[model samples]
Target: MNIFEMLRIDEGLRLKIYKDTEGYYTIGIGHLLTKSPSLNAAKSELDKAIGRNTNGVITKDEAEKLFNQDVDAAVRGILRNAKLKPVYDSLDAVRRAALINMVFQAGETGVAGFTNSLRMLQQKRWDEAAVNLAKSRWYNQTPNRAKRVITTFRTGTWDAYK
Candidate 1:
């Protein structure tokens, strides 16, 4: 299974404008539409992608386009990491994609602090890594996704794979 598909299922899609937890606006698979500079960048891109002027509302197809873009952006952001890259190199494809999911949800910087968890992953201590992953503060913020990620590390399989 592709990393993109797995992350898409985990993220889910929303085509309408919704106010975020602290009231920032977001749409189209968690893409920010307010506050961030990219909000206007996305606004303009969507306007271009769908053709003509537009409101915040978008079609699922259009949302898919944005989701694809967001994942690329997330990957690009992760690629520049000096500290995290070594841990990334030590992982297999499944473990690699698992980190991307973690990084995607919380910026790479967020996962950068996973000192013990990252080392556990690097060492291929699947069970240990899964335990460490589950106990992280990140799990509290996103228990369901974290639970799935922990399983992926433990089993070396994509839980979202059909």
Candidate 2:
């Protein structure tokens, strides 16, 4: 399965601009329509697409472009993190997708915070990893989302969503 497709579905979509969990102006699947390279980007390529118009309009195709930029940048960025490189490479593609999805939502530092879980995952201790992932702030914030990712860790399958 296309890993990008897995991310796309998990993020869902919104034709109209909406404030995300952190309340940032967002559009195009999960594009941060704001400035802040330290977090996401220098300036969102799609930001101009809005033209200072908070009430912006966009098509599904446009969302694809923006989302691709994020997945491409952040996806590779996740592996680029010095600490996670080897552990990330050790994971199978299915579990790798779970990591990508987690990093996509939590950012590199956030996922890195999962010290125990990452080690447990690296050791292929599925049960321990699942338990480690759940019962945390990440899961508390979004049970539905975390549960799916946690399940993927336990089962090492993509069946959580599909």
Candidate 3:
């Protein structure tokens, strides 16, 4: 499957905006409303389309379009941040995509909290990066997802979790 398909599987496709588990307004396959101005802007347009009188709801077509736009912005943000860090360019595509996905899920600032892991990654120390990734509140909160990402970092495989 393609990256977008993989992402859709990892982050379930939602047709309408709703509060996520952490209580953030979210829509369109885990797109957090607060994280992307593009998403917020799209939502404003959607709000207007729906007469601005009801809670935000969108058609499947609209949701898919927003998902694509949001994912593009998120990927661009990931690439922009990666460009500032030399080690990011040295990673294999799978590992790089895994990191991008993490950034998408966590936001750049949230991903930045992995200082030790990022250092290890920069130094090309896969095992250390994996271990560091596991030694965090993020890992504690989402062990399965963390394990998958850590495994991908260590082995450079998209099917690490499988």
Candidate 4:
């Protein structure tokens, strides 16, 4: 299967807008609604592709295409961040995936704000990284997912939330 198909299966396909685990209005496979130019662009692209607004529904194939585009942009956003580049390169697959997911969820700027967590990670202090992550506003906002991510950083395992 393609990367988009695998991601869709892992993320679960959604045909309509619904509150995500963190309560954000999400639709069409895992597009989180936020006030950002990139998100607006994606919305525009979706409108052009399907000729519908946020309230509209899309097939799994359509959502998959949109997700591929969105994720590609998000990955580029992560790669462009100087602060995250070394950390991203240093991590294992599970940890790298977690970081990418964080960037996707919070945006590059938002994830960059995790300076303490990043420092701890760079120091190879897993416990400190987990603690730093737990102390963040993001953690407070989404405890369950935050805990899972923290665990991933600590153990280099992606099964915590799976």
Candidate 5:
């Protein structure tokens, strides 16, 4: 199933799902939830998405492997969602790395909705871009995750988000 299907929030909360090094779904706060979505559900969903599978159905190692493949797809999806293409192409290692970090921390759609910051990135507007990047609801809602992305965008360096 896709990230949205994994979360089951097509109507209410806004979240994105990805896989970890393992192969389980994981959720992250998307930009749409800046105005208040199901924070508890989002967290709970993530917990389930990433947690160890009970009932002895899936091994931890096996789960992790499955999650990794989903994560790879999530990275690709984020770039597509962000609408960066042709000129900037998702094939760029830097962009792929950034999307991976975003997917891991913020989920596929969360990273996709970084419209303002991404626009600045396309324009090469460093300072304003960084400020805009940091001034997001996701940044405020998830400071720990936001810090890494903010730092990367600000310093023009590559780093992990979560």
Candidate 6:
């Protein structure tokens, strides 16, 4: 099966499909159309971040390893609600997917780091939230990725094909 199918989109599972695999185009997650190993590493880092958050600990040795948690369903639930709910709703499905992917990797606190974006979302300020999203660390560290997700948020769709 293709990577998207492996990711089981909309199956209510929390997982990030690295944008690239074996040096090919990325099929899922907050994938960028660029060749950045760091970006792929960032996605992997998100998984580690989740483990740290859930367990309330971070070991230097385990920093690069996947955390032990049943993150699949929880991340999906949050993503689905963020998309369908009234307050804190995503600007679009891709944005919803991307943010949930981030949460899965970064944990709630990591996701919470986008306080302004979250607040604007909670207030249902779409434009403002989108703007705030750009001002976040996620945006600063990954400008291309931020732009893609924002475009998806504004336009309501994105492609995950390889």
Q: TM-score of each candidate?
A: 0.81, 0.84, 0.79, 0.78, 0.54, 0.44
lDDT of 4 by residue, 1-162 (tens): 233433455467787655677555566767765433454554555566666664356777777677877788777887888999888888877777778777766789999889988888877899988987888778887777677667878998656755
The local distance difference test score of each candidate is 0.77, 0.77, 0.71, 0.72, 0.49, 0.46
lDDT of 5 by residue, 1-162 (tens): 233332222212223443332334333322221222445544454445557433223344444444556655665665565374421452344443444555655565566677777777677676787688787776676565566555655554454322
Q: Evaluated with TM-score, which candidate comes out highest?
A: 2
lDDT of 6 by residue, 16-88 (tens): 3334323532322322223556654554544454443322233433422232222454355464554323322
Candidate 1, pairs of clashing residues: none
> Candidate 6: lDDT of 149?
57
Prediction RMSDs, each to the true structure: 3.4, 4.0, 4.2, 4.3, 10.0, 11.1
Clashes per model (N, Cα, C within 3 A): 0, 1, 0, 0, 8, 4
Which should have the higher TM-score, number 2 or number 5? Answer: 2
Runs of candidate 6 exceeding 4 Å displacement: 1-95, 159-162
Better of 1 and 4 by TM-score: 1
Off by over 4 Å in 4: 1-11, 19-25, 33-46, 49-55
Query: Candidate 5: what lDDT?
Result: 0.49
Clashing pairs in 6: 14-72, 19-26, 20-26, 46-105
Worst 10 residues of 5 by lDDT: 5-14
Off by over 4 Å in 2: 35-46, 49-55
- In candidate 4 the C-alpha lDDT for residue 7 amounts to 48
* Candidates sorted on TM-score, descending: 2, 1, 3, 4, 5, 6
Cα lDDT over the full model 3 = 0.71
